[PDB]
Amino acid sequence: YPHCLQFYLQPPSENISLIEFENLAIDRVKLLKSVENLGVSYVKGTEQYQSKLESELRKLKFSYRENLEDEYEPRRRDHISHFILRLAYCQSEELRRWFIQQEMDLLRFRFSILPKDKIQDFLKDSQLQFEAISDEEKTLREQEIVASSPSLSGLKLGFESIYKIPFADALDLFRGRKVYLEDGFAYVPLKDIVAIILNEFRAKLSKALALTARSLPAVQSDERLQPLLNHLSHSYTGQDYSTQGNVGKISLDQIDLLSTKSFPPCMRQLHKALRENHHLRHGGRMQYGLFLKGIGLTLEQALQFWKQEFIKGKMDPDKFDKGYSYNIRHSFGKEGKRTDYTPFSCLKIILSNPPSQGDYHGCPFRHSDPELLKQKLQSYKISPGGISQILDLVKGTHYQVACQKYFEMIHNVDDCGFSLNHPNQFFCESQRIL
Amino acid sequence: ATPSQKYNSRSNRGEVVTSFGLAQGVSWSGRGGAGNISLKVLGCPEALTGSYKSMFQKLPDIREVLTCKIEELGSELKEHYKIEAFTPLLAPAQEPVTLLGQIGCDSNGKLNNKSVILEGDREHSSGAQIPVDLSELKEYSLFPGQVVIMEGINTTGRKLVATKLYEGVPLPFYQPTEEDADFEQSMVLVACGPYTTSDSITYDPLLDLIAVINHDRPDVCILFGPFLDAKHEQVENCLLTSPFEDIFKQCLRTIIEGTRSSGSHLVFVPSLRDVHHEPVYPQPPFSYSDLSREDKKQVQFVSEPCSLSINGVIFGLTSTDLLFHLGAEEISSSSGTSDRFSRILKHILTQRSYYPLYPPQEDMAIDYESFYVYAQLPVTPDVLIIPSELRYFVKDVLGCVCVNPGRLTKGQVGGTFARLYLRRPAADGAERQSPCIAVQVVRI
Amino acid sequence: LGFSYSRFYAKPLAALVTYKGREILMHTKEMVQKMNLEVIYGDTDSIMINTNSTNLEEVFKLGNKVKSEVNKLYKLLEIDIDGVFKSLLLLKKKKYAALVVEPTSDGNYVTKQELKGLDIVRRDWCDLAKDTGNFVIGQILSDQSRDTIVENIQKRLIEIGENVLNGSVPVSQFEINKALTKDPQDYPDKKSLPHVHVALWINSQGGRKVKAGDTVSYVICQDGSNLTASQRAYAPEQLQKQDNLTIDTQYYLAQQIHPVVARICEPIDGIDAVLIATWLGLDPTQFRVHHYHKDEENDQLTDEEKYRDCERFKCPCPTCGTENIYDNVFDGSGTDMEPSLYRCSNIDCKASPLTFTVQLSNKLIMDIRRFIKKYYDGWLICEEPTCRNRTRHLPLQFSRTGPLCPACMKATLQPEYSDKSLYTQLCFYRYIFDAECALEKLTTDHEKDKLKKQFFTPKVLQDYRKLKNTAEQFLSRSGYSEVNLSKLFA
Amino acid sequence: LVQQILKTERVVIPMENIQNMYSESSQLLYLLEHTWKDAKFILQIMCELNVLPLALQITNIAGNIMSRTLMGGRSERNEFLLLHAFYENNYIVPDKQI
Numbered sequence A: 001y002p003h004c005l006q007f008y009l010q011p012p013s014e015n016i017s018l019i020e021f022e023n024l025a026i027d028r029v030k031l032l033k034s035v036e037n038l039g040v041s042y043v044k045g046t047e048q049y050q051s052k053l054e055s056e057l058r059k060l061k062f063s064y065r066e067n068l069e070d071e072y073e074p075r076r077r078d079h080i081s082h083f084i085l086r087l088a089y090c091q092s093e094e095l096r097r098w099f100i101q102q103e104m105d106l107l108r109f110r111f112s113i114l115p116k117d118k119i120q121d122f123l124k125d126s127q128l129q130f131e132a133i134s135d136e137e138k139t140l141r142e143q144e145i146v147a148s149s150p151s152l153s154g155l156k157l158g159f160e161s162i163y164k165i166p167f168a169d170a171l172d173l174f175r176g177r178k179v180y181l182e183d184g185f186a187y188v189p190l191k192d193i194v195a196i197i198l199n200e201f202r203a204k205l206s207k208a209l210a211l212t213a214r215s216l217p218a219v220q221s222d223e224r225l226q227p228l229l230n231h232l233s234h235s236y237t238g239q240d241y242s243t244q245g246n247v248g249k250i251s252l253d254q255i256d257l258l259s260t261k262s263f264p265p266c267m268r269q270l271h272k273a274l275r276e277n278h279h280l281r282h283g284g285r286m287q288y289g290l291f292l293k294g295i296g297l298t299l300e301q302a303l304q305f306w307k308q309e310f311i312k313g314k315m316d317p318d319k320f321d322k323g324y325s326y327n328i329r330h331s332f333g334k335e336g337k338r339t340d341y342t343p344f345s346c347l348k349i350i351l352s353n354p355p356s357q358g359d360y361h362g363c364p365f366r367h368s369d370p371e372l373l374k375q376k377l378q379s380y381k382i383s384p385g386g387i388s389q390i391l392d393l394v395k396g397t398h399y400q401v402a403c404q405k406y407f408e409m410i411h412n413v414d415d416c417g418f419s420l421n422h423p424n425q426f427f428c429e430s431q432r433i434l
Numbered sequence B: 001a002t003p004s005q006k007y008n009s010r011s012n013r014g015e016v017v018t019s020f021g022l023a024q025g026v027s028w029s030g031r032g033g034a035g036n037i038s039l040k041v042l043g044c045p046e047a048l049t050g051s052y053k054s055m056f057q058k059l060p061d062i063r064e065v066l067t068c069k070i071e072e073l074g075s076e077l078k079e080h081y082k083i084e085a086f087t088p089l090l091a092p093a094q095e096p097v098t099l100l101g102q103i104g105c106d107s108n109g110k111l112n113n114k115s116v117i118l119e120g121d122r123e124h125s126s127g128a129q130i131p132v133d134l135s136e137l138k139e140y141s142l143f144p145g146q147v148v149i150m151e152g153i154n155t156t157g158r159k160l161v162a163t164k165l166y167e168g169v170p171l172p173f174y175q176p177t178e179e180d181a182d183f184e185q186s187m188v189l190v191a192c193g194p195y196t197t198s199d200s201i202t203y204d205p206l207l208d209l210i211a212v213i214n215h216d217r218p219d220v221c222i223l224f225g226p227f228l229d230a231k232h233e234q235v236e237n238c239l240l241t242s243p244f245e246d247i248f249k250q251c252l253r254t255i256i257e258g259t260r261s262s263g264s265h266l267v268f269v270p271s272l273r274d275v276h277h278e279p280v281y282p283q284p285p286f287s288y289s290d291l292s293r294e295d296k297k298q299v300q301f302v303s304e305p306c307s308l309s310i311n312g313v314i315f316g317l318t319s320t321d322l323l324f325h326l327g328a329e330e331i332s333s334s335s336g337t338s339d340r341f342s343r344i345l346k347h348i349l350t351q352r353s354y355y356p357l358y359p360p361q362e363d364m365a366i367d368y369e370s371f372y373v374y375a376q377l378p379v380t381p382d383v384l385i386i387p388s389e390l391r392y393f394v395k396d397v398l399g400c401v402c403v404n405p406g407r408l409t410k411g412q413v414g415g416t417f418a419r420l421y422l423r424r425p426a427a428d429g430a431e432r433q434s435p436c437i438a439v440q441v442v443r444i
Numbered sequence C: 001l002g003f004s005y006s007r008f009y010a011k012p013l014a015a016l017v018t019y020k021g022r023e024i025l026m027h028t029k030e031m032v033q034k035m036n037l038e039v040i041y042g043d044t045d046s047i048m049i050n051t052n053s054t055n056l057e058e059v060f061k062l063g064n065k066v067k068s069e070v071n072k073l074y075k076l077l078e079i080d081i082d083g084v085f086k087s088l089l090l091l092k093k094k095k096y097a098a099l100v101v102e103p104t105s106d107g108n109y110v111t112k113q114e115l116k117g118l119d120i121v122r123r124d125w126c127d128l129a130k131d132t133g134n135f136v137i138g139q140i141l142s143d144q145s146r147d148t149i150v151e152n153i154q155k156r157l158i159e160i161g162e163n164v165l166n167g168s169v170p171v172s173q174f175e176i177n178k179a180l181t182k183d184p185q186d187y188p189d190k191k192s193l194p195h196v197h198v199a200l201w202i203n204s205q206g207g208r209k210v211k212a213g214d215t216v217s218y219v220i221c222q223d224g225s226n227l228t229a230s231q232r233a234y235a236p237e238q239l240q241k242q243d244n245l246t247i248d249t250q251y252y253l254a255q256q257i258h259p260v261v262a263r264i265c266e267p268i269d270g271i272d273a274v275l276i277a278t279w280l281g282l283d284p285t286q287f288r289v290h291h292y293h294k295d296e297e298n299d300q301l302t303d304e305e306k307y308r309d310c311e312r313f314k315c316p317c318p319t320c321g322t323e324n325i326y327d328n329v330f331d332g333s334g335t336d337m338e339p340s341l342y343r344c345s346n347i348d349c350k351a352s353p354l355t356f357t358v359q360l361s362n363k364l365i366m367d368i369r370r371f372i373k374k375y376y377d378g379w380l381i382c383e384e385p386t387c388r389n390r391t392r393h394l395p396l397q398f399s400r401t402g403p404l405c406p407a408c409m410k411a412t413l414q415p416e417y418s419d420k421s422l423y424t425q426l427c428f429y430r431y432i433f434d435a436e437c438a439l440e441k442l443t444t445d446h447e448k449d450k451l452k453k454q455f456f457t458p459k460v461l462q463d464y465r466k467l468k469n470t471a472e473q474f475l476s477r478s479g480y481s482e483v484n485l486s487k488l489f490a
Numbered sequence D: 001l002v003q004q005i006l007k008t009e010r011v012v013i014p015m016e017n018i019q020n021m022y023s024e025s026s027q028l029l030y031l032l033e034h035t036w037k038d039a040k041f042i043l044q045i046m047c048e049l050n051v052l053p054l055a056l057q058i059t060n061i062a063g064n065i066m067s068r069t070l071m072g073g074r075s076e077r078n079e080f081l082l083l084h085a086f087y088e089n090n091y092i093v094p095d096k097q098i
């Protein structure tokens, strides 16, 4: 929205704090993930896409007020965050492709925001030399320009600017006879112009990432930056909310209703297994116990629930006290953290602890077979068109997007108004609508 | 009411307790600020001027610093003693072999002859450690972290039976220039803290020192810390009603304004027992901005440790209690008739550092990245100033005059300060001619 | 090519070859993950695959599919089948015990026990510790499921702790034997060594004197003189014939059985040292005190959890003498948000601690000094739970991670007080007085302005700013909270 | 080595005990038997690993001296192989550095 449209070169030489470093990295990761989610769920030409993208930009403080020349806060934020994430995403080729694809969507959106006035100044100032034509030359060669133009309908050479460029830089256009040439200059409208800018940006970004990947071992020795390079998408989400504590009051006899109405497919499947077989494996026990702790259950209530469910399995109550009470009290209590104290997130469920025979944990859209997935979803009273859309998104590895559509369909809303990244957050947002 | 009674009621005021050089009376009077005075800090990058660089180290950096220390010292000794080649510590050899390493104990206790361990260099032995047997060694003097070259027998590769200990070689003396010998006679007063009794805050000994400085009008005055004792009872329990920085500024202003009429240059050396300063060795110079233009030519702030040439005469200044730290963890083969102070001074002068003991005393913060650069001896100092809690002394060791006047106030009673007369004789002669003519340690 | 002292040395060629090797390893890991399978270990030519399958035929088919895909991707490079495990436990890098599987004809197999990097150096371990260790390793190397093994181990530990507390363990299962290398009087560490103390007592009390190479037996008991456990060492014959003393069950439960148990039970998920401590008795809180802070550096945080281990600010009230504890800006929850500095913890005291802004700004200073000196003490402790070698000397012999322990030759020393701990403590000291960031944390503007006008006058704001600056002075340039991007990118 | 490769135990005689064994004929005879068994064990362990055929084949492929490949060092053998290859293809080989 400001003059933040910039080709990302000339790495910064400023110095900053650790907290600013990590906040910038997290904010840029969140913005890129939001761009991907918007591109997958929507298209690149609707008002919803632009509105949500600009709302994300405004919330993350990437386009805001000005200051005295040097310290324009959103410009500094954008520059430093981009060059920080280059290090994190330069390692692997797949990560490089992801980073390049997501970074160009933001550039395209920023270019679309600008009015037809500032883009000329941006082009002239950007690299070294770029120029357009005035009204006299535009009208003098109008017929030739429209004749040489692509299948663009009509003779309406409207108010859209037409730019003259060296023919070589327009190679991808003039090799197929789609532009007008005169004295080695090609006349090109805005669409092909932005295509050219995207192509050059992709080339430069790929080259810069490839060069950066070489000098990566010189920085792997820093212990402060270890959670940056390797652990930006490992098990901890971009920005998670549901932790221990909070406020909540949920009865014990109401769990059955919430299993059908509120619980996500994975948690409801675990609940069905627990209520049917009266026993769960270690992964299922840990996952469901952490989930139940997250929703607001207390130590006494959880102990009573697990004991009552396990006694129905014909075991000794003293055996439960000596075998399973310790684990629950340790989960609800003090240190021994980071694996027994925070409820599992969507990324941890998907990318860690794959299930096997006898294990019912994991994400149904990720681990369960597609045929079993359809068989499951048919039991939830899901419309066949929604089933087809969910299966289509599952193919493109958009499991969380499929769950977003699941929530929107089951709770009868057009848009959930958020991006889900945690089953406990799914439950909380289902309770909010009620 | 009670505090500062015993010191004020003292009776040993003005008593001279030690003399060295040529016999002198009590009328030690100088020219003050008259004549040419050359005060310049020398050595490595100049004694560090900025605040600091870090408060966070990396273990490989410390490893590299220690390896470099061992390697350079071993190369110098090899070039001096013409050693053909060193031998890896772990390689068995029936014939006697020479090994390069650094002394260390095998536990967390005090070093003794049964617990010596030699740790080899990275270049030759890849940092290997072997026990050392001293049953067949006649004369030796060992402390932890001493870079040493031993000649012994190692037939099994797991233990060294040492037979000969090579003596260390000190750095060359500062070479005088023709301009340095043209200077005249000067006097330097030296004093070290604390400047108040253990139960008072009135700083009466500081006022007494100011009066003495005004009376004697020396050419230079050096004052060591602490100026606000961190171990003081009223300080360590936080009873003072004013910030530490404000009290330090008040004391500095009182010192500077008091000796303004004398015209004597003032050199303030910080110590690790100052509350308002950073407790990391080496320490940056004192920060002071409320300074007038006239006092900028008479007040200088130097670091710790410092290599400071006064009128072409090098002084080695250090406020840390190196003598007491090193003297406690030393082992020697002779104890009947031997001077411990001379031996530890020889160790200090031949080890080429201002704090050669490693690992340091338990309450000692050292930044080794800055230690390796800002805390090395450039040359052998002409006069070494090492104030310490031990008894006052002045000794000529290896051509260097080492003076320890002690604390100005020891416990509840008063202490001593020192005064030195400086002049450079004719260049030609028997090489070493000590510029420091007379030293006098006098009670305050 | 890659050897520095070779005849055909070529650094650029070696660098290119290593880069291509890293690229191939990354591509292999990515393709296996894209296959929807998890890789548990990768070392420069080796990829370990956990198939999550019981059918050996299916495992072989999956491995051959991986081979076919890899050899289709490349031309000459070929991954190979080498062996399959039935059980495994990865403790750290390049360290495991397992059951190698030898496939027989059509489905059956033979299991052989393999161990590497699971060697124990100290012989100072009692009979009970060795018995528990062998029992737990035998259960772990068995073929039962994880839940059954964990339940059996838990039951065994519960029974062992109950027997130790009750006293059913024979006294012969309490004798600890150590062999000396020096005379008892020539031990600099003396006081912290139990065997040295008991040998010195034997030498200076009765007849037979211990010499180098001799073995001495000792037992830890309870004198009631509140000395260290090492100094409280007695002889089993002396303990049996003496009446005033009794067995110290805490030492045997904490420093004897827990280390040998936790050196194997730590890798298993859902099991930690504190859980094992709770299984054996009423240890937990003292064990979390005994626990390590950097140990969890294998997994941004919230304000309540980053400052969990930091020490709260303790200061005596200058006019009443009662200690005051500061943990954050406010006090309590809800409507009653008085500043923590408004009133001292003593109810009867009527003096406002903020009026003593100077004294606080003095006390804080020394609180920063202490924690600095600790960080510069250089105390290193061995990472192996059975060794725990404490030293201040940093060895020049380094492993691939850090300094290599000199007592246990295969272990890495780690700092006892890390730099990150000091940074977090300084941040906590800054945060306990940061009203600026504590008021923006309020969701609504109404409560923020109400508290701003009720208590936080510009004078109190200036006092809090001064107390913040007291720690900001230490955090400004020192500590490498600064990040230099000039060295980071150029 | 004899415990793993040969799967047979081997007693170890400390150097301190040796002088005591010189006071009686049976102990000295046992010492001689220990030396004989040690030599036989080295011979057996060498035969089990086929050290000599391996060395002969390796020095035949690489083309170097048998004593040098018996001493150890992969770099020497690879260097000799590459020197043979470069000499065949009419090349100037590097000199030895020291």
Ligand code: SF4
Residues within 6 Å of the ligand: A264, A265, A266, A267, A346, A349, A350, A362, A363, A364, A365, A399, A400, A403, A422, A423, A426
């Ligand atoms: S996307 Fe998350 S909430 Fe939905 S089924 Fe998968 S793991 Fe459960």
Ligand SMILES: [Zn+2]
Residues within 6 Å of the ligand: C317, C318, C319, C320, C321, C322, C344, C345, C346, C349, C350, C351
């Ligand atoms: Zn009070």
Ligand SMILES: [Zn+2]
Residues within 6 Å of the ligand: C382, C383, C384, C387, C388, C389, C405, C406, C407, C408, C411
């Ligand atoms: Zn160890």
